[PDB]
Design a protein around this ligand. Structure first.
Ligand code: MG
Ligand code: ZN
Ligand code: ZN
Lengths: 58, 58, 46, 65, 1095, 245, 405
RNA sequence: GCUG
């Protein structure tokens, strides 16, 4: 609201509630995706495609 | 350009066209005017089904 | 069916047969331009 | 490259006037007065002679001849 | 002084504009090449000590091309463009090699061919009258400054770099202020840095494996004794205290003498070469070699004396410490610290590497053959190869990659192809500057407009997009300086009272009165009176005793006075005001025009002076005579010169919002207009020419200087600004059909098709075979209709899609490989040129002409940054008409002006309407121009409303419109982008072999990419089926056989792995995934698949 | 040097003095044409150096013969009985001075042109009037009598002959003499005092029509033809109504 | 192609036309963020019956007339559609039977051909028989007597005087009863995007997607026909400062310049009072910036008052079709202090923004205040300061697009 | 490199 840019709270009530539902606040970075998702190709389609595919073969 | 983003998440697609866009106030909001040239190249597969038989033959 | 080419500087018609170096007599130019078509061409004035 | 035969907006023939306009300018006639003598009263017609750049003469210097 | 404007044409006849490119190559071909040859003169062989190969004089000759074994005839720039040859001249050098045992001197031995920029001193075009140009087929109004390499004209873009020889105080990522001086000499260019990584000062260099504490470096240099080091750096409590931690570090170690520090530095020198280096260079000796040629090389040791290197090192240390306190780091965005390098410097660096590579290769050949092959003499002249130098430069110009490993220089994008969209596009490209930092995405860095750029770089001319501030354009009156000798500046300074620095202990440098003198980065001494050196040096320059471009500047905060004759520094001419009165004096201004004086006379009479950005910091320029004060030092020659070539073409730029002016600069380059008087003769890949070009009604002073009017790019159009139809909403324009029919906007697009028939080493040569007649018809087949008997098409004949322009057969015996026209619309062959390339290979070039009338979807711009597509074409009868009977050619929506704030366009309609009626061309020059009040009076005399609003009636209804409509003539330029060339549609077409997905190019039949952002929107819509159809069925759907037990793909119902067909089952998968599973399996990542029946 | 497509467009724009009513519209296709539906004009010009010329020869006209192609060069080729129906010189390009192209020695233009009847709606080349426009008649009225130096400024505000100042008693007074000449620049509104003393209006039902022909046919004939074309459009629809009922 | 929200892909029905160019209605151009300044867009044809149905039911324009972010309408009137409607619905617009019939006639095309038009009884009836524009606009909402839509809205328009809900002086309170505008003129608030007080929104919410879409199509036919025949144009006279603004600006500029001088002396010779958070050289800059802002605001108010009720720039600002009063003030009165990062232009040279001013000058105009208007023209130093501020915006947009993506 |  500081930048104009009105938005529903129900969008932010979802983004916050995703971001903090597994114990601790999991920021949406490359690193927070590993602690949010279990499936590999969803992580592998995101950043670090090399390590996420080898580590899930290990 | 890599396979994960270039060839899997986003793929080149058939049955598509790109042209410059111009105004038409006489068209309903749900309609787009398509050039007759692009219309001739782009095709939709229609199965003969007893209601389109006469129309398809023409 | 003779092939006659006109040079860029001399502007003299030169007959060059196949597999002949493109040099023009009366000058040393190596650029030669083919002559205009004899065939009638139709243009819509529109 | 060469003077347009007809004015773009009005449609008056302005091809005939180019040779006279150049001659009037060669004499003491002013550009506004020269256009007035040719009879180009409307502004649309006047700009065609006033704004025309004659490149045919310059281009021909490089033509085969 | 009404004619203070007259000085801009006069400075421009000699310097300015595209000259900054030409005078630069001229210095390289006439002065720099010989300096490089003296530096790498003398090649000596290890195998024989006696053998020596010095170079005595190098000359670069006239450009000539020899098409025979020994003809050596002269060549012309046009012929090279047509035959795809390189315009270049021979580099001939004089040598005195050892030979058998004598000292044979050879005069004039060719070492290779040098590319030659057009209009350069060595170029044939220089000194030629316009009539002479016609025989050479070159346009007289051609900028020059470009190289014809392999038939493509290439421009080396100017590059902005931080100045060399000057210490730069800059924060590291850690916030740790450091320092870095790049030493550029004629022998070695190296980077020496200083760093405080733990609160203690270390010097870093690439030849040293580890950072060396500075006190050890000082002791190695020879300033043994801590007091002398401390006295040199500072005697203030803070400076000494902060250098206190650094003193302990040497004290903790046992270094206390030169030898014990030199040995310590040696144990750290990287000794990379252990092979072919013989035996030599002890560790102490290697250090005395590094400290004397590698560290701070610009400062020169006389006889292994570092007295000079040590003081300079102390100045660097003091500058880090004062900066570390207040955090006053030097700005790297100030144009004073940045020097622009043009062609000469880039070519000299490339040549320096190629000459050292040619010399090295000759030594390696000599060392190998002199001691082994025979008593028969080794003559270098026979083994010398022309190719190494010629091929090297050409490749760097042809492909813009400056990969010089010796200097660790790896820059790509140095050269670009000259743009021939228009005359303005070519002139703008010559004045184009490329930034050093190119990956920066911080808004407030290089991308910002810096006040230092005033008068040097155009404020509004910049590409909008990935490089908003990365690419900059030079202003009209700017001179980039070239290197000068410096013998006189050193002498004037000593006689002017500058005491030597060797004769003083360092304590002086910290007194408040003493100031240090630096010339191009080397200390020339210490002077107590700054003002007398500065005001005497300026007086001497005005009398002409010292060069005009030498600049004296003084920084009070750091007590130093800087004299710069380096070169690469931007300089702008300014009138000198002494005692509140300008020095031009009116009478001198008349004399320039009459002919008694030229610009140089004004410079040496003290009337005019050149000021660089550093000198400007010390001056108080006044833009106008009325603004003159007591403090004002100079006066600007002309205010409008602040804008550049593209910016000038805009009428009344000052009356518009600034973003709009930036857009016009980009659009002007893309406009379709006359290119040159030789445009018809040229056979370029793409040429767009307006059929009937017209000069602009509202001109600017810059248009006159650039000679835009001689070859214009647009047409003046009567425009009514009104809302009509509703087909002109978001930037659309309405055009009358009759004006398009009468010829408005008619353009010609010329494309070039090139075929080369080659002769192989096998002696088998491609051939052109004649048209294949169908006998029954006694006529050629449709595909071969246009071909003449020879097999090449004939000028004047229409070509349809799929017709064969040249029937060419290539030996596998011959398999036809035809050149076939592939144009969605017919084109007419205009010229077919047959020629031989550098290696004779029968190059054939065809020019195809297509004429396109303006059509809905074409782009037209107004010269005020407003670009619109043609929404509707209306018949003349439907267009509104004024009483005179003028109906508008173009109707423009009034809504564009309020948000855009383009008041200048509104002024331009009024000025043009007044000018056409008067018969006069009004001027809309920046910061000046015709006032609205004067123009309105002219309209009233001619019977028109002063405001220019006219009473119109409606063509559709026949009744008067309620509001008066502004009606006037405005210049409109048709932009190159056209809907005919931008329309692409693909159904089922060619699929790439690797992924089986569609192609990526309209030319290749293309196919559009539904990318991740489009895919994300479809996921939001919730459409599962649409995503599957678009991304699998209509892209790459495929069936694979998978085994149930293993999980591994099989073939034809079998698995070569668990050789039991029973478990194989079919699956549907995007084919790309099959490639991913295969590449995974090959790399050892096994993507095992479990298959379940649908239920 | 001129491109054939550009040269074709220039030739289409040039006007022909042939009377349209005599000829008939060509059917779709039917390129060959007939004596009734078409006129054929042949232009053949070759530029040659003047054999007897001055040494300087700075002027192209002295140096070259046929340097400029003009519309006078075009020559009518009669088809069938057209030659008898049209006496020599009836069918010719109207202007006679339009510059089609410019040539240099050794350059030749040879071409044949077919002329067909057309309406302006299809292309502007077929339009018969340089401009046709109508203006309602101006009726300036002075609401209050204006006398003195004010008359001189009121005369200046309007067009040159519309306002005449007469000294009735040795004192200047303003009257409107020729309102038709008024160009409606509306400069009276700039002067504050005179804005309220005059009313600028146009009589709605009086239209002054100006027609300038391209020379193809006399202007009086063109206006008569236009009225007949409107009469034809109404008749075509009336015939359709008869067929429907 | 630069897809940033859900609305960048939208389905459309396809109707083949001879001209080559993808032509759409201009109401749907703000979802695409698409101007017509050379833009190109992509078309995809679904090849399955299941994909065709999902595109029509889910991705169709009629089903997606509201943004998912707030629920505000995104498909709505823009530019000339908005101005034709504001001009038609003004109190002065009065029409005779023939002019009324022609404007209403434009609606009868594309499925309106089979509807019998209802002409409302004329608002004026005895000295002369005349209708009102508000009456003609109301036919867009209910074209025929058998249309069932009876739309109702009661909302403050922009320009509302603050008092008399429907008897405002400016005629800026909108009341629509039974699909009949009884008061007010249509502006961006009632006909444009971003508002839930839109008529098209009330039509979507209460009568359905089809009724809203039919009305929007009717406006795109009626609004252009009135404006083309009425005539709307801008000229130099529209942006020319009058005598009242000219005398006022001189007084405002001198007063602000002298007050700034007083503070600059107070920082130097005497003592400057400091805000508790602020410090010296920051209190002076912030307080000077407020005074410079006052000069531009007061000059703007004078410019708006002098402007006639017929300026094309004012009409576009009074409705929200294009522009703002800051844009009009900058063109006619005074462009303001150019601000880089919220502060006056920084010193590129040492202690000086440019070499054309004295060192250590904190005076307004040496730090980016441009007194001149766009119409008067910018002096060379003023032009450079304005370009610097303008480039900051251009660089910001290019960098921002990459970060958001 | 430029358009989008
Ligand atoms: Mg756009
Ligand atoms: Zn020749
Ligand atoms: Zn298996």
């Amino acid at each position: 609201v500081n930048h104009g840019m009105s938005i529903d709270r129900r969008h932010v009530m979802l983004l916050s509630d995703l971001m903090t539902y597994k114990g601790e606040v999991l920021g949406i970075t490359r690193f927070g995706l590993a602690k949010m998702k279990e499936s590999v190709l969803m992580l592998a389609s995101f950043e670090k495609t090399a390590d996420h595919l080898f580590d899930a073969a290990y | 350009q890599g396979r994960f983003r270039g060839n899997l998440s986003g793929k080149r697609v058939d049955f598509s066209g790109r042209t410059v866009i111009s105004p038409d106030p006489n068209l309903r909001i749900d309609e787009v005017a398509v050039p007759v040239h692009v219309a001739k190249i782009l095709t939709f597969p229609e199965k003969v089904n007893k209601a389109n038989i006469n129309f398809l033959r023409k | 069916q003779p092939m006659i080419y006109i040079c860029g500087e001399c502007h003299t018609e030169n007959e060059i047969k196949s597999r002949d170096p493109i040099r023009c007599r009366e000058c040393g130019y190596r650029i030669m331009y083919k002559k205009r078509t004899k065939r009638l061409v139709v243009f819509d004035a529109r | 490259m060469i003077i347009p035969v007809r004015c773009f907006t009005c449609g008056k023939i302005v091809g005939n006037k180019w040779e006279a306009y150049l001659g009037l300018l060669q004499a003491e006639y002013t550009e506004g007065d020269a256009l007035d003598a040719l009879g180009l009263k409307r502004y649309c017609c006047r700009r065609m002679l006033l704004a025309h750049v004659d490149l045919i003469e310059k281009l021909l210097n490089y033509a085969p001849l | 002084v009404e004619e203070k404007w007259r000085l801009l044409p006069a400075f421009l006849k000699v310097k300015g504009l595209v000259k900054q490119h030409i005078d630069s190559f001229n210095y390289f071909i006439n002065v720099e090449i010989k300096k490089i040859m003296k530096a790498n003169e003398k090649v000596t062989s290890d195998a024989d000590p006696m053998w020596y190969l010095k170079y005595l004089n190098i000359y670069v000759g006239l450009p000539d091309v020899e098409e025979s074994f020994n003809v050596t005839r002269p060549v012309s720039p046009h012929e090279c463009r047509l035959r795809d040859m390189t315009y270049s001249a021979p580099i001939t050098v004089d040598i005195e090699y050892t030979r058998g045992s004598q000292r044979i001197i050879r005069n004039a031995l060719p070492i290779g061919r040098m590319p030659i920029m057009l209009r350069s001193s060595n170029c044939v075009l220089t000194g030629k009258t316009p009539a002479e140009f016609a025989k050479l087929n070159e346009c007289p109004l051609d900028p020059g400054g470009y190289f014809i390499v392999k038939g493509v004209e290439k421009v080396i873009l100017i590059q902005e770099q931080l100045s060399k020889n000057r210490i730069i105080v800059e924060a590291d990522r850690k916030g740790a202020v450091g320092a870095s001086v790049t030493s550029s000499t004629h022998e070695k260019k190296s980077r020496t840095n200083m760093a405080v990584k733990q609160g203690r000062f270390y010097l870093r260099h690439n030849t040293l494996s580890e950072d060396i504490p500075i006190v050890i470096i000082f002791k190695a240099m020879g300033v043994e004794s801590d007091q002398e080091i401390v006295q040199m750096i500072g005697t203030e409590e803070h400076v000494m205290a902060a250098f206190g931690p650094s003193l302990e570090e040497c004290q903790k170690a046992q270094i206390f003498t030169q030898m014990q520090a030199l040995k310590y530095i040696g144990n750290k020198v990287r000794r990379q070469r252990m092979w072919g280096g013989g035996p030599k260079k002890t560790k102490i000796e290697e250090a005395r070699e590094l400290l004397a040629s590698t560290i701070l090389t610009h400062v020169p040791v006389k006889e292994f004396n570092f007295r000079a290197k040590c003081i300079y090192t102390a100045v660097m240390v003091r500058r880090v410490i004062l900066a570390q306190g207040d955090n006053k780091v030097d700005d790297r965005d100030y144009y004073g610290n940045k020097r622009l390098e043009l062609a000469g410097q880039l070519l000299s660096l490339l040549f320096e590497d190629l000459f050292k590579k040619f010399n090295s290769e000759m030594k390696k050949i000599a060392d190998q053959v002199i001691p082994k092959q025979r008593a028969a003499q080794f003559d270098v002249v026979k083994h010398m190869r022309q190719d190494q130098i010629t091929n090297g430069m050409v490749n760097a110009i042809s492909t813009g990659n400056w990969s010089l490993k010796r200097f660790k220089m790896d820059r790509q994008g140095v050269t670009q192809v000259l743009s021939r969209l228009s005359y303005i596009s070519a002139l703008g490209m010559m004045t184009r500057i490329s930034s050093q930092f190119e990956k920066t995405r911080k808004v407030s860095g290089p991308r910002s407009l810096q006040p230092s750029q005033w008068g040097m770089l155009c404020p509004s001319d910049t590409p909008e997009g990935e490089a908003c501030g990365l690419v900059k354009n030079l202003a009209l009156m700017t001179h980039i300086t070239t290197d000068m000798e410096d013998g006189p500046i050193v002498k004037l300074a000593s006689n002017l009272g500058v005491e030597d620095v060797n004769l003083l202990c360092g304590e002086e440098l910290s007194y408040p009165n003493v100031f240090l003198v630096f010339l191009n980065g080397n200390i020339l001494g210490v002077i107590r009176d700054h003002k007398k050196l500065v005001n005497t040096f300026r007086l001497m320059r005005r009398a002409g005793y010292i060069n005009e471009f030498v600049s004296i500047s003084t920084n009070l905060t750091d007590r130093c006075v800087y004299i710069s004759s380096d070169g690469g520094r931007l300089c702008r001419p300014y009138i000198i005001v002494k005692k509140q009165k300008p020095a031009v004096t009116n009478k001198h201004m008349e004399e320039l025009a009459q002919g008694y004086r030229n610009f140089e006379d004004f410079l040496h009479e003290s009337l005019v002076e050149y000021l660089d950005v550093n000198e400007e910091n010390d001056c108080n320029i006044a833009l106008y005579e009325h603004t003159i004060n007591k403090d004002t030092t100079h006066l600007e020659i002309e205010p409008f010169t602040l804008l550049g070539v593209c910016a000038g073409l805009i009428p009344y730029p000052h009356h518009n919002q600034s973003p709009r002016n930036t857009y016009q600069c980009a659009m002007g380059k893309q406009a379709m207009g006359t290119i040159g008087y030789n445009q018809r003769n040229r056979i370029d890949t793409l040429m767009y020419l307006l059929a009937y070009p017209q000069k602009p009604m509202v001109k600017t002073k810059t248009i006159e200087l650039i000679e835009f009017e001689k070859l214009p790019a647009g047409q003046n159009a009567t425009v009514a600004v009104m809302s009509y139809s509703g087909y002109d909403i978001e930037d659309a324009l309405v055009l009358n059909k009759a004006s398009l029919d009468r010829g408005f906007g008619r353009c010609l697009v010329y494309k070039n098709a090139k075929c080369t028939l080659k002769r192989y080493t096998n002696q088998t040569f491609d051939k052109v075979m004649g048209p294949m007649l169908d006998a029954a018809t006694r006529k050629p087949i449709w595909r071969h209709e246009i071909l003449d008997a020879d097999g090449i098409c004939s000028p004047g004949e229409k070509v349809e899609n799929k017709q064969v322009l040249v029937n060419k057969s290539m030996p596998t015996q011959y398999k036809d490989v035809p050149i076939t026209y592939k144009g969605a619309t017919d084109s007419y062959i205009e010229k077919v040129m047959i020629s031989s390339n550098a290696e004779d290979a029968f190059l054939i070039k065809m020019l195809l002409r297509q004429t396109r009338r303006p059509e809905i979807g074409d782009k037209f711009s107004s010269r005020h940054g407003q670009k619109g597509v043609c929404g509707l074409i209306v018949p003349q009868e439907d267009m509104p008409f004024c009483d005179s009977g003028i109906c508008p050619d173009i109707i423009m929506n009034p809504h564009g002006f309020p948000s855009r704030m383009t008041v200048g366009k509104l002024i331009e309609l009024l000025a043009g309407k007044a000018g056409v009626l008067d018969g006069r061309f009004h001027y809309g020059t920046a910061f000046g121009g015709s006032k609205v009040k004067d123009v309105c009076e002219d309209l009233v005399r001619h019977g028109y409303n002063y405001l220019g609003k006219d009473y119109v009636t409606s063509g559709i209804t026949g009744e008067p419109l309620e509001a008066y409509i502004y009606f006037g003539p405005v210049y409109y330029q048709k932009l190159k982008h056209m809907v005919l060339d931008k329309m692409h549609a693909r159904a089922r077409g060619p699929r790439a072999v690797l992924t089986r997905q569609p192609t990526e190019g309209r030319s290749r039949d293309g196919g559009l990419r539904l990318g991740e952002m489009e895919r994300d929107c479809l996921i939001g819509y919730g459409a599962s089926m649409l995503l599957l159809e678009r991304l699998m069925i209509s892209s790459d759907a495929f069936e694979v056989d998978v085994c149930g037990q293993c999980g591994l793909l099989g073939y034809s119902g079998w698995c070569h792995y668990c050789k039991s067909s029973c478990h194989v089952s079919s699956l549907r998968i995007p084919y790309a995934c099959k490639l991913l599973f295969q590449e995974l399996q090959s790399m050892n990542i096994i993507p095992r698949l479990k298959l379940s029946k649908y239920n | 040097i001129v491109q054939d497509e550009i040269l074709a467009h220039r030739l289409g724009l040039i006007p022909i003095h042939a009377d349209p009513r005599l000829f008939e519209y060509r059917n779709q296709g039917d390129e060959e044409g007939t004596e009734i539906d078409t006129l054929q004009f042949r232009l053949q010009v070759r530029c040659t150096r003047n054999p007897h010329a001055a040494k300087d020869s700075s002027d192209p006209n002295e140096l070259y013969v046929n340097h400029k192609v003009y519309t006078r060069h075009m020559t009518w080729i009669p088809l069938g009985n057209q030659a008898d129906l049209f006496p020599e010189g009836t069918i010719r390009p109207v202007h006679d001075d339009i510059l089609i192209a410019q040539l240099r020695p050794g350059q030749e233009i040879d071409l044949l042109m077919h002329c067909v009847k057309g309406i302006g709606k299809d292309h502007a080349k077929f339009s018969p009037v340089a401009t046709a426009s109508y203006r309602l008649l101006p009726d300036i009225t002075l609401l209050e009598p204006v006398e003195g130096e004010a008359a001189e400024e009121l005369s200046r505000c309007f067009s040159p002959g519309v306002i005449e100042v007469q000294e009735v008693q040795g004192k200047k007074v303003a009257r409107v003499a020729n309102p038709r000449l008024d160009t409606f620049s509306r400069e009276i509104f700039r002067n504050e005092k005179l804005k309220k003393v005059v009313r600028l209006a146009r009589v709605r039902d009086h239209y002054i029509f100006s027609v300038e022909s391209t020379g193809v046919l006399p202007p009086d004939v063109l206006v008569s033809e236009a009225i007949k074309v409107l009469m034809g459009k109404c008749r075509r629809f009336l015939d359709e109504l008869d067929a429907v009922q | 192609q630069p897809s940033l929200h859900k609305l960048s892909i939208m389905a459309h029905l396809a109707r083949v036309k001879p001209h080559r160019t993808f032509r759409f209605n201009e109401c749907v151009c703000t979802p695409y963020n698409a101007d017509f300044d050379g833009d190109e867009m992509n078309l995809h044809l679904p090849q399955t019956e299941e994909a065709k149905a999902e595109a029509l039911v889910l991705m169709g324009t009629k089903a997606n007339l509201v943004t998912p972010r707030n629920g505000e309408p995104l498909i709505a009137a823009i530019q000339d559609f908005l101005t034709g409607a504001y001009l038609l619905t003004l109190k002065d617009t009065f029409f005779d039977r023939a002019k009324a019939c022609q404007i209403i006639a434009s609606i009868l095309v594309g499925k309106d051909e089979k509807i019998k038009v209802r002409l409302p009884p004329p608002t004026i009836l005895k000295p002369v028989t005349l209708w009102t524009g508000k009456q003609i606009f109301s036919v867009i909402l209910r074209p025929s007597d058998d249309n069932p839509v009876r739309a109702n809205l009661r909302t403050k328009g922009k320009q509302y005087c603050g008092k008399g809900e429907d008897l405002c002086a400016n005629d800026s309170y909108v009341t629509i009863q039974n699909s009949e505008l009884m008061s007010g003129s249509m502006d961006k608030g009632t006909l444009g995007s971003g508002s839930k007080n839109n008529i098209f929104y009330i039509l979507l919410r209460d009568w359905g997607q089809n009724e809203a879409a039919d009305a929007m199509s009717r406006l795109a036919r009626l609004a252009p026909v009135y404006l083309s025949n009425r005539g709307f144009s801008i000229g130099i006279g529209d942006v020319t400062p009058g005598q009242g603004l000219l005398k006022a600006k001189y007084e405002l500029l001198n007063a602000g310049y002298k007050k700034c001088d007083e503070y600059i002396e107070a920082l130097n010779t005497g003592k400057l009072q400091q805000q508790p958070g602020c410090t010296a050289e920051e209190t002076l800059e912030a307080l000077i910036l407020k005074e410079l802002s006052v000069i531009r605001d007061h000059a703007g108010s004078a410019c708006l008052r002098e402007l006639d009720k017929s300026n094309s720039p004012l009409t576009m600002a009074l409705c929200g079709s294009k522009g703002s009063f800051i844009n009009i003030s900058q063109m006619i009165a005074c462009v303001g202090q150019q601000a880089i990062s919220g502060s006056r232009v920084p010193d590129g040279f040492e202690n000086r923004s440019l070499p054309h001013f004295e060192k250590h000058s904190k005076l307004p105009a040496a730090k980016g205040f441009v007194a001149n208007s766009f119409y008067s023209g910018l002096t060379p130093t003023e032009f450079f300061f304005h370009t610097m501020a303008g480039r900051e915006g251009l660089v910001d947009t290019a960098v921002k697009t990459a970060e958001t993506g």
